[PDB]
């Protein structure tokens, strides 16, 4: 029952530090070379670093050399990635991966991975969103625009979770300003407008912002 569980990801500003952990279970961790691999938004997987079974040999990708340090605690079945001097381009999901057993640890396939932990490096600062109605103008669409917030994520529900069918909450896009913007829409029977009230419930926990915006015909 091999399992790898990464933790420690978060949102920081350029130049700062983050320590990632990966807890391993279900195998003799101390007999395997271990790796970190990362995947930036909309890009391919990129190998970052590796460490030998006994922690004596470590190798690093050129893009992180001198800024990251891979390490391991074999008595705790844990692998670590300490980052400092982080850059925007270090933003990625970071994966812990096991080196294929009898394959050269320097260039192996990886037979087990974790679910990953997300690292976000940005000069933006925490900010709650503005929520604006997308007013409906026999099927009618309406929604809420969740603009200018940082960092991810926000959650949007409709009618406190009572309204689920026909709801589409879109992935946020990152604007020029460095802030996110998201839209959430729902289609309803034109004839229901005025009968049901429609409320997007918006929550951005990083800024402790909760907004309930009611959407009216204009």
């Amino acid at each position: 029952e091999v399992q790898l569980v990464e933790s420690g990801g978060g949102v920081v500003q350029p130049g700062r530090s983050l320590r990632l952990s990966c807890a391993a279970s279900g195998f003799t961790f101390s007999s395997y070379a271990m790796h970190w691999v990362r995947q930036a938004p909309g890009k391919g997987l990129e190998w970052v670093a590796l460490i030998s079974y006994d922690g004596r040999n470590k190798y690093y990708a050129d893009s992180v050399k001198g800024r990251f340090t891979i390490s391991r605690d074999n008595s705790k079945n844990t692998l670590y990635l300490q980052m400092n001097s982080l850059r925007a381009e270090d933003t990625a999901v970071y994966y812990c991966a096991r080196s294929y057993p009898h394959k050269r640890w320097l260039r192996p396939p990886f037979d087990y991975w974790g679910q990953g932990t997300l690292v976000t490096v940005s000069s933006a600062s925490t900010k709650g969103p503005s929520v604006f109605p997308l007013a409906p103008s026999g099927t009618a669409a309406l929604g809420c625009l969740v603009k200018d917030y940082f960092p991810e994520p926000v959650t949007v529900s409709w009618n406190s979770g009572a309204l689920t069918s026909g709801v589409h909450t879109f992935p946020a896009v990152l604007q020029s300003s460095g802030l996110y913007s998201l839209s959430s829409v729902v289609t309803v029977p034109s004839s229901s407008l005025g009968t049901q009230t429609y409320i997007c419930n918006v929550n951005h926990k990083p800024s402790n912002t909760k907004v309930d915006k009611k959407v009216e015909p204009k």
Binding site: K43, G44, Y95, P109, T139, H168, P171, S183
Partner: protein, 214 residues
């Protein structure tokens, strides 16, 4: 580092289909190539290593082939669990490298988008900013072009869009496009239009509003 080029970027398939994804290497990697399966929020999974060997317990409907510089992953009788992304990896030489990935989505009949346009709210115009939203609802396939027009003037560089994941029940997508202008420039013009082209439409659909006089 060895560059790995995967093709195609995406493909659609039905259950029972035979699906082929290729990966090419900038220099031969002999047979040192692995294939992985990736699903959102889950751990990557090793399917095939050494170009052709299946990992223990991997279903035999997966096969791998190739040697040198060109490589093939084939899923022969695709099953519902196989809708996912797939990436190759070389381990011939030290910095291991991966392809960009290939997404396999569910095939269905063509479905035209229902299009809606939303003017900026008066509360937003207060801020000094105008966001105009165009919604393309429940269409297939994923490929769609959204074109913003302001008093017939083609817009470029001032819009962003995002697309949902394929819907579990009806296998469609929806798309949101946002056009951003200053409040000053929004008030300079009258007609805001999003023109949508898609396979489900015999001809492009335009939805518009007239800023004033409404």
């Amino acid at each position: 580092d060895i560059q790995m080029t995967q093709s195609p970027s995406t493909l659609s398939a039905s259950v029972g289909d035979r699906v082929t994804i290729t990966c090419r290497a900038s220099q031969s990697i002999s047979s040192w190539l692995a294939w992985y399966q990736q699903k959102p929020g889950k751990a990557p999974k090793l399917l095939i290593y050494d170009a052709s060997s299946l990992e223990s317990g991997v279903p035999s409907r997966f096969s791998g082939s190739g040697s040198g510089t060109e490589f093939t992953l084939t899923i022969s009788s695709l099953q519902p669990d196989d809708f996912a992304s797939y990436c190759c990896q070389q381990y011939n030489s030290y910095p291991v490298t991966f392809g960009q990935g290939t997404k396999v989505d569910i095939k269905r009949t063509v479905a035209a988008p229902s299009v809606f346009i939303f003017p900026p709210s008066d509360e937003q115009l207060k801020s000094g900013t105008a966001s105009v939203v165009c919604l393309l609802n429940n269409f297939y396939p994923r490929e769609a072009k959204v074109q913003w027009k302001v008093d017939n003037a083609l817009q470029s560089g001032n819009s962003q869009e995002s697309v949902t994941e394929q819907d579990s029940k009806d296998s469609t997508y929806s798309l949101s496009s946002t056009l951003t202008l200053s409040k000053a420039d929004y008030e300079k013009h009258k007609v805001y239009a999003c023109e949508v082209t898609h396979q489900g439409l015999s001809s492009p659909v335009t939805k518009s509003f007239n800023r004033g006089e409404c």
